């Protein structure tokens, strides 16, 4: 759910959404890393974890609209940056 | 022997001055045991002086020195173990236990302040290693020494 | 702990060892002077950590590794799609 | 098991001339032939080939024919003229992956264990390499059945040879974008490679043609990889990605400044070498 | 380079031009104390018997060397004023006597000041050298001179240091020599070809 | 040659930088210390 | 005096107009002070009571301080000039250097390899 | 104040207390600007 903006959650939030206490969530997430469904790092003092890689899931015909839209401007990024190469690098090789 | 005695008394060349005692012992081989067994002292003390402590055990592990065992070569092996493990009281028990043959020669008396500085800073940099911002009180505790001399001495390290 | 813990205090670890913080420092001393576990401990805030260089190189280097795996990854799906179109829309 | 393949211009033309000598059929014919070669160090090689006679009718498009007498006699002749050369697989002319090429490979798998196919081009246009090779792989899964012998494209490239480079480079004599300074990188990959990423960008857009209108398989095995793409979007320009970048650009332009600094001194010294050639020639000759 | 040519002081001879060998010794120590750092000073000039026995007859120079090595900062300015005074009245050093002690002061300030981070300004008047306003205007013109890497606080009476990298300082002289040689080949480039 | 059509009319640089910083400051800085012995 | 940060001395020159009236010009000189420190009131001014920055310019407590304090920020508060200072958003761009600089690298390579 | 308008110095003046604090802005090495001082001179020496 969390975007690539942060995708960094806290043990207070784990204790909120899983309603399991503070001294069990570390064993839970280390078990998750030991299984390897998730790949991330553990900070203890700021009570946050930098979860990076998730186990991939399935989705319906609605999320392909969002992946379509994220594909969409990613096309014209390549168009827009490549047009500088074609325009400016034209006189080097015809 | 005395080609290495005076060169050790000026501390200029422990390599060749080491080699003079080596040649002295090779001349003392199997014909003069009291000069040979004291000729082990001036080479292995020159090697701990050279701060290569393992080769003491390599030499006395050799069969030429397995013949000439004794109290004083063990009194060199314990010093080699002390500078091997790099701690001060490890050496202080070595002077204390074997004081009758360690603290015996008039030049051997004047080799232990500089070795005390080398081992002082050696165990010092042994213990300073693992950490970050720290206290001087805990390092005075772990060294088991004062705070003024450790503060000034570490200031001599950073200076 | 060195694998998964970026940074931990000098009470949580000692609670995970069920012994003193002093004995904990003796345990973390002889392994980093063995340098078989690299760690940079603290004894004023107790904020100890694992595997912390500065890395002027591996940020952009492993970034370029993600570039290579990325271009291989988009290289993977591309020839996979076409046969899937050919098992429905060939003839 | 197979790393990559090596394709020669001799076999590359050797499909095309046969396509011309069957070019009078006009209507429809794929050029199926026997691919010959070796593989060493798990690196596939293709050096020679020929083409088996082959016809196929559109109604009941599962009726194919390979003259195995034409296989055995001509391969016996090629073994006789070259015992080093042997079978390596097969090929077909490959516009768009014909359907009988699911069991052509099964028809002649008894010759080569990795009986590889090669898809070529007869109408040459792309912005890449129009050379293709799959591999036969069967893997029963939890979303189908048993017989799952699908084809998987092993990566491909045109390999060269010291024998063939002389005659091939004689056969150009036309245009050759050598003098590699920076321009060869700038054009073969900084212009060309971005348009290489254009088509791989566009291919999943062509798959995205199933939102409510396309074919029946929805997701299953397409979205873990794309989910790993958008998972694998790189780091933004805020955290430390800026700082090491200005660090190492800040180191690279130093060396650029050194080289550009010395180059002008070189040309200056040459200009001194030219004015000595001027001033002691105008008076001497007159 | 001058101490580097003055490296030996052993093969050097009872000269015609420095008829005192010991004047040559004073010269090589006066150039060495700027020319080399502590490791070098803490092995070369401190353990040399051939360099030790000739300053053995020197009361002030042996003091002036050991006031710096032995952290005797207050008398170091006194003997510094002596040697700087004679250097002012000396041939071949009178071209650069002001250049000498302006490096000596910032050298000792670097020595003491690059030990601690939170040492205050009022500490240095009694243990280092008298004059709080002198240390004020003296460090102020050196931070203002772009050296002596620290950053002084004023109205809470504390001196703070930092540590810079070897990047921008090493960058600085590169752009200096680059602009200098650019001026050189630009000027010559207009000299030749009319 | 060297005509100038006329319409109108080391040894030094490191020394000159010594003048650049210490232009006019503490010239005879010899007795000010002995004058700060009693004030400081 | 308008060049440097001389401000109160300018009001002393408003205490010394010796030649003639100069009133039509010193009133535009009023206005050019009004927008000036109406503009540079926005600096790193951590908190100021309703005395100092109040009486530096002209106005003690008319609603002209509401005209500036509500024209701009520095909101009327509990004897308080509110120092709002973000200065955070606009840095950390590699992309504009990765556009302009990617232009400039090609501008290097033009006059590096291609004869002109 | 006009040194902040001119931008000669950055940090704040404690106008209430009286002191002028200044931050320690270091590491200009990780900036675009030494590449700018380069880029002024790269094309220059290419031109000469």
Task: Characterise this structure.
This is part of a larger assembly, with eight protein chains of eight kinds. Chain C is built from three helices and three strands; from the N terminus they run βααββα. Chain C has helices at residues 12-15, 21-29, 58-86, and strands at residues 5-8, 39-40, 48-50. A three-stranded antiparallel sheet of chain C has the order 1-3-2, with no helix packed on it. In chain D, the strands form three sheets. Chain D has a three-stranded antiparallel sheet with strand order 4-1-5, covered by helices on one side. By secondary structure, chain E is mostly helical. Chain E contains ten helices and two strands. Chain E has helices spanning 2-5, 21-35, 38-47, 49-55, 59-69, 73-88, 97-113, 124-127, 132-143, 168-191; strands at residues 150-153, 158-161. In chain E, helix 5 packs across helix 6 (73-88) and helix 6 runs antiparallel to helix 7 (97-113). Classes of the chains: A alpha+beta (94), B mainly alpha (159), C mainly alpha (91), D mainly alpha (286), E mainly alpha (194), F mainly alpha (40), G mainly alpha (116), H mainly alpha (48). Chains in contact: A-C, A-D, A-G, B-C, B-E, C-D, D-E, D-G, D-H, E-F, E-H, G-H. At the D-G interface, helix 7 of D face helix 5 of G. Chain A: This is 26S proteasome non-ATPase regulatory subunit 13. Chain A: Belongs to the proteasome subunit S11 family.
Output the structural class of chain E.
Answer: mainly alpha
Shape of chain H: elongated
- Principal-axis shape of chain E: globular
User: Based on the structure, what is the oligomeric state of the protein chains?
Assistant: part of a larger assembly
Structure annotation, total helices of chain E: 10
Short description:
Chain H: This is 26S proteasome non-ATPase regulatory subunit 3. By secondary structure, chain E is mainly alpha-helical.
Keywords for this entry:
part of a larger assembly; 8 chains; A: 94 residues; alpha+beta; 3-stranded antiparallel β-sheet; C: 91 residues; mainly alpha; 3 helices; 3 strands; 46% helix; elongated
Which secondary structure elements does this structure contain, and how are they paired or packed?
The structure is cut from a larger assembly and holds eight protein chains of eight kinds.
Chain E: H1 2-5, H2 21-35, H3 38-47, H4 49-55, H5 59-69, H6 73-88, H7 97-113, H8 124-127, H9 132-143, E1 150-153, E2 158-161, H10 168-191
Antiparallel strand pairs in E: 1-2
Helix pairs in contact in E: 5-6, 6-7
Chain F: H1 13-21, H2 32-36
Chain H: H1 2-5, H2 33-47
